[PDB]
């Protein structure tokens, strides 16, 4: 799968586009277990996707709801995870990644929702601007097209 290389080089660019620290690719497996296939993070932090690589995130919330609002292709922007009035758990994990805000856009590739595209930036208690959110989703879907193209070519 050389297409991953294409993702690697682009994920680093979109990372700078939204002035983010790290940008993760979250794929939905047949069991919706939450597999991270790749992430572009500054060398100043832990890469995460290195020792184990397979970073699973079993979010029973999104699993039971089959993606929830994300299933309808709706994006979500969190300017701050605390101020939003969120419930316990999920937040504890995010705080550990040195992040307090993020943006989630849906990436469709193939027949269903392939995965989500999230970008985080050193806490970042700022407002996610329209210019950033809409471009992130655009590139996300754009990358999914490369997945389709490669699947069409059937790289063997
Ligand atoms: C402990 C209680 C378990 C848990 C519960 C829980 N989750 C949510 C809400 C959300 N879960 C996600 C999932 C993700 N966010 C990411 O950045 C990633 C990596 C890409 C994943 C997998 C999301 C986005 C939400 C918010 C959107 C939504 O609600 O659909 C809640 C509600 C309160 C909250 O939003 O924090 C609860 C109670 N979460 C876990 O991770 C534990 C398994």
Short mmCIF file of N, CA and C and ligand atoms in Angstrom, two decimals:
data_model
loop_
_atom_site.label_atom_id
_atom_site.label_comp_id
_atom_site.label_asym_id
_atom_site.label_seq_id
_atom_site.Cartn_x
_atom_site.Cartn_y
_atom_site.Cartn_z
N UNK A 1 0.83 -1.21 0.00
CA UNK A 1 0.00 0.00 0.00
C UNK A 1 0.87 1.26 0.00
N UNK A 2 1.23 1.73 -1.19
CA UNK A 2 2.06 2.93 -1.31
C UNK A 2 1.23 4.19 -1.09
N UNK A 3 -0.09 4.04 -1.22
CA UNK A 3 -1.02 5.16 -1.03
C UNK A 3 -0.88 5.79 0.36
N UNK A 4 -0.39 5.01 1.33
CA UNK A 4 -0.18 5.51 2.68
C UNK A 4 0.89 6.60 2.68
N UNK A 5 1.85 6.47 1.77
CA UNK A 5 2.91 7.45 1.62
C UNK A 5 2.31 8.79 1.21
N UNK A 6 1.34 8.72 0.29
CA UNK A 6 0.63 9.89 -0.17
C UNK A 6 -0.09 10.56 1.00
N UNK A 7 -0.63 9.74 1.89
CA UNK A 7 -1.29 10.25 3.09
C UNK A 7 -0.28 10.91 4.02
N UNK A 8 0.84 10.24 4.23
CA UNK A 8 1.89 10.75 5.12
C UNK A 8 2.33 12.16 4.74
N UNK A 9 2.61 12.37 3.47
CA UNK A 9 3.10 13.65 3.01
C UNK A 9 2.02 14.75 3.03
N UNK A 10 0.77 14.36 2.82
CA UNK A 10 -0.32 15.33 2.80
C UNK A 10 -0.79 15.68 4.21
N UNK A 11 -0.84 14.68 5.08
CA UNK A 11 -1.26 14.88 6.46
C UNK A 11 -0.36 15.91 7.17
N UNK A 12 0.92 15.94 6.80
CA UNK A 12 1.86 16.88 7.39
C UNK A 12 1.59 18.30 6.89
N UNK A 13 1.05 18.40 5.68
CA UNK A 13 0.78 19.69 5.06
C UNK A 13 -0.50 20.30 5.61
N UNK A 14 -1.54 19.49 5.73
CA UNK A 14 -2.80 19.95 6.29
C UNK A 14 -2.61 20.31 7.77
N UNK A 15 -1.64 19.65 8.39
CA UNK A 15 -1.26 19.93 9.77
C UNK A 15 -0.84 21.39 9.90
N UNK A 16 -0.06 21.85 8.94
CA UNK A 16 0.43 23.22 8.94
C UNK A 16 -0.66 24.18 8.45
N UNK A 17 -1.53 23.69 7.58
CA UNK A 17 -2.63 24.48 7.03
C UNK A 17 -3.51 25.06 8.14
N UNK A 18 -3.91 24.20 9.08
CA UNK A 18 -4.74 24.64 10.19
C UNK A 18 -3.89 25.05 11.39
N UNK A 19 -2.57 25.18 11.16
CA UNK A 19 -1.61 25.57 12.22
C UNK A 19 -1.71 24.63 13.41
N UNK A 20 -1.96 23.36 13.14
CA UNK A 20 -2.14 22.39 14.18
C UNK A 20 -0.84 21.74 14.58
N UNK A 21 -0.88 21.05 15.71
CA UNK A 21 0.27 20.35 16.22
C UNK A 21 0.29 18.95 15.66
N UNK A 22 -0.84 18.29 15.76
CA UNK A 22 -0.98 16.94 15.27
C UNK A 22 -2.32 16.75 14.57
N UNK A 23 -2.34 15.82 13.63
CA UNK A 23 -3.52 15.50 12.85
C UNK A 23 -3.60 13.99 12.72
N UNK A 24 -4.66 13.42 13.22
CA UNK A 24 -4.79 11.98 13.25
C UNK A 24 -5.84 11.48 12.28
N UNK A 25 -5.62 10.28 11.78
CA UNK A 25 -6.54 9.63 10.89
C UNK A 25 -7.18 8.47 11.64
N UNK A 26 -8.48 8.50 11.75
CA UNK A 26 -9.21 7.53 12.54
C UNK A 26 -10.12 6.70 11.64
N UNK A 27 -9.79 5.44 11.47
CA UNK A 27 -10.56 4.58 10.57
C UNK A 27 -11.54 3.70 11.34
N UNK A 28 -12.71 3.51 10.76
CA UNK A 28 -13.70 2.64 11.35
C UNK A 28 -13.53 1.23 10.82
N UNK A 29 -13.27 0.31 11.72
CA UNK A 29 -13.11 -1.09 11.37
C UNK A 29 -14.47 -1.75 11.30
N UNK A 30 -14.57 -2.98 10.76
CA UNK A 30 -15.84 -3.73 10.71
C UNK A 30 -16.55 -3.80 12.08
N UNK A 31 -15.77 -3.74 13.16
CA UNK A 31 -16.34 -3.76 14.51
C UNK A 31 -16.39 -2.37 15.13
N UNK A 32 -16.03 -1.34 14.34
CA UNK A 32 -16.03 0.06 14.81
C UNK A 32 -15.19 0.22 16.09
N UNK A 33 -14.03 -0.42 16.11
CA UNK A 33 -13.18 -0.44 17.29
C UNK A 33 -12.32 0.82 17.44
N UNK A 34 -12.23 1.60 16.39
CA UNK A 34 -11.47 2.84 16.46
C UNK A 34 -9.99 2.66 16.21
N UNK A 35 -9.61 2.33 15.00
CA UNK A 35 -8.20 2.13 14.69
C UNK A 35 -7.57 3.38 14.06
N UNK A 36 -6.44 3.80 14.62
CA UNK A 36 -5.67 4.89 14.06
C UNK A 36 -4.67 4.32 13.06
N UNK A 37 -4.78 4.74 11.81
CA UNK A 37 -3.90 4.22 10.78
C UNK A 37 -2.66 5.10 10.61
N UNK A 38 -2.79 6.38 10.94
CA UNK A 38 -1.69 7.32 10.79
C UNK A 38 -1.99 8.62 11.51
N UNK A 39 -0.94 9.35 11.84
CA UNK A 39 -1.06 10.65 12.47
C UNK A 39 0.21 11.46 12.23
N UNK A 40 0.04 12.74 11.98
CA UNK A 40 1.16 13.63 11.80
C UNK A 40 1.27 14.53 13.01
N UNK A 41 2.26 14.27 13.84
CA UNK A 41 2.47 15.03 15.05
C UNK A 41 3.89 15.59 15.09
N UNK A 42 4.04 16.74 15.71
CA UNK A 42 5.34 17.36 15.87
C UNK A 42 6.26 16.46 16.68
N UNK A 43 7.53 16.47 16.34
CA UNK A 43 8.53 15.62 17.01
C UNK A 43 8.73 16.03 18.47
N UNK A 44 8.17 17.17 18.84
CA UNK A 44 8.27 17.67 20.20
C UNK A 44 7.45 16.82 21.18
N UNK A 45 6.56 15.99 20.65
CA UNK A 45 5.74 15.12 21.48
C UNK A 45 5.95 13.67 21.09
N UNK A 46 5.18 12.79 21.71
CA UNK A 46 5.23 11.38 21.40
C UNK A 46 4.42 11.11 20.13
N UNK A 47 5.00 10.33 19.22
CA UNK A 47 4.36 10.03 17.95
C UNK A 47 3.09 9.19 18.14
N UNK A 48 3.07 8.38 19.20
CA UNK A 48 1.93 7.50 19.53
C UNK A 48 1.90 6.30 18.59
N UNK A 49 1.71 6.57 17.31
CA UNK A 49 1.70 5.54 16.30
C UNK A 49 3.14 5.14 15.97
N UNK A 50 3.76 4.43 16.89
CA UNK A 50 5.13 4.01 16.71
C UNK A 50 5.41 2.63 17.28
N UNK A 51 5.43 2.48 18.62
CA UNK A 51 5.72 1.19 19.26
C UNK A 51 4.67 0.14 18.92
N UNK A 52 3.43 0.43 19.26
CA UNK A 52 2.34 -0.48 18.99
C UNK A 52 1.74 -0.23 17.63
N UNK A 53 1.76 1.05 17.22
CA UNK A 53 1.19 1.50 15.94
C UNK A 53 -0.33 1.44 15.96
N UNK A 54 -0.86 0.26 16.25
CA UNK A 54 -2.29 0.07 16.29
C UNK A 54 -2.84 0.70 17.55
N UNK A 55 -3.36 1.89 17.42
CA UNK A 55 -3.95 2.56 18.53
C UNK A 55 -5.46 2.46 18.41
N UNK A 56 -6.03 1.53 19.14
CA UNK A 56 -7.46 1.32 19.13
C UNK A 56 -8.15 2.21 20.16
N UNK A 57 -9.33 2.71 19.82
CA UNK A 57 -10.08 3.56 20.71
C UNK A 57 -11.51 3.07 20.72
N UNK A 58 -11.81 2.20 21.66
CA UNK A 58 -13.12 1.61 21.74
C UNK A 58 -14.08 2.57 22.40
N UNK A 59 -14.71 3.38 21.59
CA UNK A 59 -15.67 4.33 22.10
C UNK A 59 -17.07 3.76 21.96
N UNK A 60 -17.56 3.19 23.06
CA UNK A 60 -18.88 2.57 23.10
C UNK A 60 -19.98 3.57 22.71
N UNK A 61 -19.70 4.85 22.89
CA UNK A 61 -20.65 5.90 22.57
C UNK A 61 -20.90 5.93 21.07
N UNK A 62 -19.84 6.05 20.29
CA UNK A 62 -19.93 6.07 18.83
C UNK A 62 -20.24 4.69 18.25
N UNK A 63 -19.96 3.63 19.00
CA UNK A 63 -20.16 2.28 18.48
C UNK A 63 -21.64 1.96 18.49
N UNK A 64 -22.26 2.20 19.63
CA UNK A 64 -23.68 1.93 19.83
C UNK A 64 -24.53 2.81 18.91
N UNK A 65 -24.06 4.02 18.65
CA UNK A 65 -24.79 4.96 17.83
C UNK A 65 -24.40 4.87 16.35
N UNK A 66 -23.50 3.93 16.03
CA UNK A 66 -23.03 3.74 14.65
C UNK A 66 -22.45 5.03 14.07
N UNK A 67 -21.67 5.73 14.88
CA UNK A 67 -21.06 6.96 14.44
C UNK A 67 -21.79 8.18 14.98
N UNK A 68 -23.02 7.98 15.42
CA UNK A 68 -23.81 9.06 15.95
C UNK A 68 -24.08 10.11 14.90
N UNK A 69 -23.81 11.36 15.23
CA UNK A 69 -24.02 12.46 14.29
C UNK A 69 -23.03 12.39 13.14
N UNK A 70 -21.93 11.70 13.35
CA UNK A 70 -20.89 11.58 12.35
C UNK A 70 -21.33 10.66 11.21
N UNK A 71 -22.34 9.84 11.48
CA UNK A 71 -22.86 8.91 10.48
C UNK A 71 -23.59 9.67 9.37
N UNK A 72 -24.20 10.79 9.73
CA UNK A 72 -24.93 11.61 8.77
C UNK A 72 -23.99 12.57 8.05
N UNK A 73 -22.70 12.43 8.31
CA UNK A 73 -21.71 13.28 7.67
C UNK A 73 -21.68 14.67 8.26
N UNK A 74 -21.97 14.77 9.54
CA UNK A 74 -21.95 16.05 10.23
C UNK A 74 -20.61 16.24 10.94
N UNK A 75 -20.05 17.43 10.83
CA UNK A 75 -18.77 17.72 11.49
C UNK A 75 -19.01 18.36 12.84
N UNK A 76 -18.00 18.35 13.69
CA UNK A 76 -18.13 18.93 15.01
C UNK A 76 -16.85 19.67 15.38
N UNK A 77 -17.00 20.84 15.98
CA UNK A 77 -15.86 21.66 16.37
C UNK A 77 -15.88 21.94 17.86
N UNK A 78 -14.82 21.55 18.53
CA UNK A 78 -14.69 21.77 19.96
C UNK A 78 -13.64 22.83 20.24
N UNK A 79 -14.08 24.00 20.69
CA UNK A 79 -13.15 25.09 21.01
C UNK A 79 -12.49 24.85 22.36
N UNK A 80 -13.17 24.08 23.20
CA UNK A 80 -12.65 23.65 24.49
C UNK A 80 -13.51 22.53 25.03
N UNK A 81 -12.87 21.47 25.48
CA UNK A 81 -13.57 20.29 25.96
C UNK A 81 -14.20 20.48 27.34
N UNK A 82 -13.69 21.42 28.11
CA UNK A 82 -14.22 21.66 29.45
C UNK A 82 -15.38 22.64 29.43
N UNK A 83 -15.17 23.77 28.77
CA UNK A 83 -16.17 24.84 28.68
C UNK A 83 -17.45 24.37 27.97
N UNK A 84 -17.33 23.36 27.13
CA UNK A 84 -18.48 22.85 26.39
C UNK A 84 -19.48 22.13 27.32
N UNK A 85 -19.01 21.76 28.52
CA UNK A 85 -19.89 21.11 29.48
C UNK A 85 -20.03 19.62 29.24
N UNK A 86 -18.98 19.01 28.72
CA UNK A 86 -18.97 17.58 28.42
C UNK A 86 -19.01 16.72 29.68
N UNK A 87 -19.39 15.47 29.50
CA UNK A 87 -19.49 14.51 30.58
C UNK A 87 -18.12 13.88 30.90
N UNK A 88 -18.00 13.16 32.04
CA UNK A 88 -16.76 12.48 32.43
C UNK A 88 -16.36 11.40 31.41
N UNK A 89 -15.08 11.03 31.43
CA UNK A 89 -14.48 10.10 30.47
C UNK A 89 -14.36 10.77 29.11
N UNK A 90 -13.49 10.23 28.24
CA UNK A 90 -13.25 10.78 26.90
C UNK A 90 -12.40 12.03 27.01
N UNK A 91 -12.75 12.87 27.96
CA UNK A 91 -12.04 14.09 28.23
C UNK A 91 -10.70 13.79 28.90
N UNK A 92 -10.70 12.78 29.76
CA UNK A 92 -9.50 12.38 30.49
C UNK A 92 -8.41 11.91 29.53
N UNK A 93 -8.84 11.26 28.46
CA UNK A 93 -7.93 10.75 27.46
C UNK A 93 -7.35 11.89 26.63
N UNK A 94 -8.20 12.84 26.27
CA UNK A 94 -7.79 13.99 25.46
C UNK A 94 -6.79 14.87 26.21
N UNK A 95 -7.08 15.11 27.49
CA UNK A 95 -6.21 15.91 28.35
C UNK A 95 -4.81 15.29 28.42
N UNK A 96 -4.76 13.97 28.32
CA UNK A 96 -3.51 13.23 28.38
C UNK A 96 -2.67 13.46 27.12
N UNK A 97 -3.33 13.73 26.00
CA UNK A 97 -2.63 13.98 24.74
C UNK A 97 -2.18 15.45 24.65
N UNK A 98 -2.32 16.18 25.77
CA UNK A 98 -1.93 17.60 25.85
C UNK A 98 -2.80 18.46 24.94
N UNK A 99 -4.03 18.03 24.76
CA UNK A 99 -4.96 18.72 23.90
C UNK A 99 -6.24 19.09 24.67
N UNK A 100 -6.81 20.25 24.38
CA UNK A 100 -8.06 20.67 25.03
C UNK A 100 -9.13 21.00 23.99
N UNK A 101 -8.73 21.13 22.73
CA UNK A 101 -9.66 21.44 21.66
C UNK A 101 -9.29 20.68 20.40
N UNK A 102 -10.26 20.49 19.51
CA UNK A 102 -10.05 19.73 18.29
C UNK A 102 -11.22 19.89 17.34
N UNK A 103 -11.05 19.39 16.13
CA UNK A 103 -12.07 19.44 15.11
C UNK A 103 -12.23 18.06 14.47
N UNK A 104 -13.47 17.63 14.29
CA UNK A 104 -13.75 16.32 13.72
C UNK A 104 -14.51 16.45 12.41
N UNK A 105 -13.92 15.96 11.33
CA UNK A 105 -14.59 15.97 10.03
C UNK A 105 -14.72 14.53 9.50
N UNK A 106 -15.83 14.22 8.83
CA UNK A 106 -16.08 12.87 8.30
C UNK A 106 -15.40 12.62 6.94
N UNK A 107 -14.73 11.48 6.84
CA UNK A 107 -14.06 11.09 5.61
C UNK A 107 -14.74 9.87 4.99
N UNK A 108 -15.39 10.07 3.87
CA UNK A 108 -16.05 8.99 3.16
C UNK A 108 -15.15 8.46 2.06
N UNK A 109 -15.01 7.15 2.00
CA UNK A 109 -14.18 6.52 1.00
C UNK A 109 -14.71 5.14 0.69
N UNK A 110 -15.40 5.02 -0.42
CA UNK A 110 -15.93 3.75 -0.81
C UNK A 110 -17.44 3.70 -0.73
N UNK A 111 -17.95 2.86 0.16
CA UNK A 111 -19.38 2.65 0.29
C UNK A 111 -19.96 3.27 1.57
N UNK A 112 -19.14 3.40 2.61
CA UNK A 112 -19.60 3.99 3.87
C UNK A 112 -18.56 4.94 4.42
N UNK A 113 -18.80 5.41 5.63
CA UNK A 113 -17.88 6.28 6.32
C UNK A 113 -16.60 5.52 6.62
N UNK A 114 -15.52 5.91 5.97
CA UNK A 114 -14.25 5.26 6.14
C UNK A 114 -13.69 5.58 7.51
N UNK A 115 -13.67 6.85 7.84
CA UNK A 115 -13.19 7.26 9.12
C UNK A 115 -13.30 8.74 9.33
N UNK A 116 -12.85 9.18 10.47
CA UNK A 116 -12.86 10.57 10.81
C UNK A 116 -11.46 11.16 10.71
N UNK A 117 -11.40 12.45 10.52
CA UNK A 117 -10.15 13.15 10.45
C UNK A 117 -10.13 14.21 11.53
N UNK A 118 -9.22 14.08 12.46
CA UNK A 118 -9.16 14.99 13.58
C UNK A 118 -7.84 15.73 13.64
N UNK A 119 -7.90 16.98 14.02
CA UNK A 119 -6.72 17.79 14.17
C UNK A 119 -6.70 18.43 15.54
N UNK A 120 -5.56 18.35 16.20
CA UNK A 120 -5.41 18.86 17.54
C UNK A 120 -4.24 19.84 17.57
N UNK A 121 -4.28 20.83 18.45
CA UNK A 121 -3.16 21.77 18.51
C UNK A 121 -2.93 22.32 19.92
N UNK A 122 -1.92 21.75 20.62
CA UNK A 122 -1.43 22.23 21.95
C UNK A 122 -2.51 22.92 22.76
N UNK A 123 -3.48 22.15 23.23
CA UNK A 123 -4.65 22.70 23.92
C UNK A 123 -5.53 23.43 22.90
N UNK A 124 -5.13 24.65 22.54
CA UNK A 124 -5.81 25.41 21.51
C UNK A 124 -7.21 25.81 21.88
N UNK A 125 -7.35 26.56 22.96
CA UNK A 125 -8.66 27.03 23.42
C UNK A 125 -9.19 28.18 22.56
N UNK A 126 -9.03 28.04 21.27
CA UNK A 126 -9.44 29.03 20.29
C UNK A 126 -10.70 28.58 19.57
N UNK A 127 -11.22 29.44 18.72
CA UNK A 127 -12.37 29.10 17.91
C UNK A 127 -11.91 28.57 16.57
N UNK A 128 -12.38 27.40 16.20
CA UNK A 128 -12.04 26.83 14.91
C UNK A 128 -12.74 27.61 13.82
N UNK A 129 -11.96 28.24 12.96
CA UNK A 129 -12.52 29.10 11.94
C UNK A 129 -13.06 28.31 10.77
N UNK A 130 -14.06 28.89 10.12
CA UNK A 130 -14.74 28.29 8.97
C UNK A 130 -13.71 27.89 7.91
N UNK A 131 -12.80 28.81 7.61
CA UNK A 131 -11.73 28.61 6.63
C UNK A 131 -10.93 27.31 6.88
N UNK A 132 -10.77 26.95 8.15
CA UNK A 132 -10.01 25.76 8.51
C UNK A 132 -10.87 24.50 8.44
N UNK A 133 -12.03 24.56 9.08
CA UNK A 133 -12.93 23.41 9.17
C UNK A 133 -13.34 22.88 7.79
N UNK A 134 -13.71 23.78 6.90
CA UNK A 134 -14.19 23.40 5.59
C UNK A 134 -13.07 22.85 4.70
N UNK A 135 -11.85 23.32 4.92
CA UNK A 135 -10.74 22.88 4.10
C UNK A 135 -10.26 21.51 4.58
N UNK A 136 -10.31 21.30 5.89
CA UNK A 136 -9.92 20.03 6.49
C UNK A 136 -10.79 18.90 5.95
N UNK A 137 -12.10 19.12 5.94
CA UNK A 137 -13.05 18.13 5.44
C UNK A 137 -12.83 17.88 3.95
N UNK A 138 -12.50 18.95 3.23
CA UNK A 138 -12.26 18.86 1.80
C UNK A 138 -11.07 17.96 1.51
N UNK A 139 -9.94 18.23 2.16
CA UNK A 139 -8.74 17.42 1.98
C UNK A 139 -8.99 15.99 2.45
N UNK A 140 -9.77 15.86 3.52
CA UNK A 140 -10.11 14.54 4.04
C UNK A 140 -10.80 13.69 2.99
N UNK A 141 -11.80 14.26 2.33
CA UNK A 141 -12.52 13.54 1.28
C UNK A 141 -11.63 13.34 0.06
N UNK A 142 -10.78 14.33 -0.19
CA UNK A 142 -9.83 14.28 -1.30
C UNK A 142 -8.88 13.09 -1.15
N UNK A 143 -8.43 12.86 0.08
CA UNK A 143 -7.54 11.75 0.37
C UNK A 143 -8.27 10.43 0.21
N UNK A 144 -9.57 10.44 0.53
CA UNK A 144 -10.37 9.25 0.40
C UNK A 144 -10.53 8.83 -1.05
N UNK A 145 -10.43 9.80 -1.96
CA UNK A 145 -10.54 9.53 -3.38
C UNK A 145 -9.32 8.76 -3.85
N UNK A 146 -8.17 9.07 -3.26
CA UNK A 146 -6.93 8.38 -3.57
C UNK A 146 -7.02 6.93 -3.14
N UNK A 147 -7.76 6.70 -2.06
CA UNK A 147 -7.98 5.36 -1.55
C UNK A 147 -8.83 4.58 -2.53
N UNK A 148 -9.81 5.26 -3.12
CA UNK A 148 -10.71 4.64 -4.08
C UNK A 148 -9.96 4.35 -5.37
N UNK A 149 -9.19 5.32 -5.83
CA UNK A 149 -8.37 5.17 -7.03
C UNK A 149 -7.43 3.96 -6.89
N UNK A 150 -6.75 3.87 -5.76
CA UNK A 150 -5.83 2.77 -5.51
C UNK A 150 -6.58 1.44 -5.42
N UNK A 151 -7.78 1.47 -4.85
CA UNK A 151 -8.60 0.27 -4.73
C UNK A 151 -9.09 -0.17 -6.11
N UNK A 152 -9.36 0.81 -6.96
CA UNK A 152 -9.80 0.58 -8.33
C UNK A 152 -8.68 -0.06 -9.14
N UNK A 153 -7.47 0.45 -8.95
CA UNK A 153 -6.30 -0.08 -9.62
C UNK A 153 -5.94 -1.45 -9.07
N UNK A 154 -6.33 -1.68 -7.81
CA UNK A 154 -6.06 -2.93 -7.11
C UNK A 154 -4.56 -3.17 -7.02
N UNK A 155 -3.94 -2.50 -6.07
CA UNK A 155 -2.51 -2.59 -5.89
C UNK A 155 -2.12 -3.93 -5.28
N UNK A 156 -1.50 -4.76 -6.08
CA UNK A 156 -1.05 -6.06 -5.66
C UNK A 156 0.42 -6.22 -6.02
C1 LIG B 1 -15.85 6.45 28.99
C2 LIG B 1 -17.20 6.95 29.57
C3 LIG B 1 -16.04 6.08 27.51
C4 LIG B 1 -16.55 7.30 26.72
C5 LIG B 1 -17.82 7.86 26.83
C6 LIG B 1 -18.30 9.02 26.11
N1 LIG B 1 -17.89 9.45 24.87
C7 LIG B 1 -18.56 10.62 24.52
C8 LIG B 1 -18.51 11.43 23.39
C9 LIG B 1 -17.63 11.35 22.34
N2 LIG B 1 -16.63 10.23 22.00
C10 LIG B 1 -15.89 10.60 20.82
C11 LIG B 1 -14.85 9.79 20.24
C12 LIG B 1 -13.61 10.23 19.79
N3 LIG B 1 -13.04 11.49 19.79
C13 LIG B 1 -11.77 11.58 19.24
O1 LIG B 1 -11.08 12.58 19.14
C14 LIG B 1 -11.46 10.22 18.81
C15 LIG B 1 -10.17 9.96 18.14
C16 LIG B 1 -10.30 10.44 16.69
C17 LIG B 1 -12.52 9.42 19.14
C18 LIG B 1 -12.68 7.96 18.92
C19 LIG B 1 -16.42 11.77 20.49
C20 LIG B 1 -15.92 12.53 19.30
C21 LIG B 1 -17.37 12.22 21.25
C22 LIG B 1 -18.07 13.53 21.03
C23 LIG B 1 -19.13 13.53 19.91
C24 LIG B 1 -20.29 12.65 20.32
O2 LIG B 1 -20.73 12.75 21.49
O3 LIG B 1 -20.78 11.86 19.47
C25 LIG B 1 -19.44 10.94 25.65
C26 LIG B 1 -20.30 12.15 25.78
C27 LIG B 1 -19.56 13.34 26.43
C28 LIG B 1 -18.41 13.74 25.52
O4 LIG B 1 -18.67 14.09 24.35
O5 LIG B 1 -17.24 13.70 25.98
C29 LIG B 1 -19.30 9.94 26.60
C30 LIG B 1 -20.02 9.85 27.91
N4 LIG B 1 -15.62 7.72 25.88
C31 LIG B 1 -14.49 6.96 25.82
O6 LIG B 1 -13.52 7.22 25.09
C32 LIG B 1 -14.63 5.81 26.82
C33 LIG B 1 -14.72 4.50 26.04
#
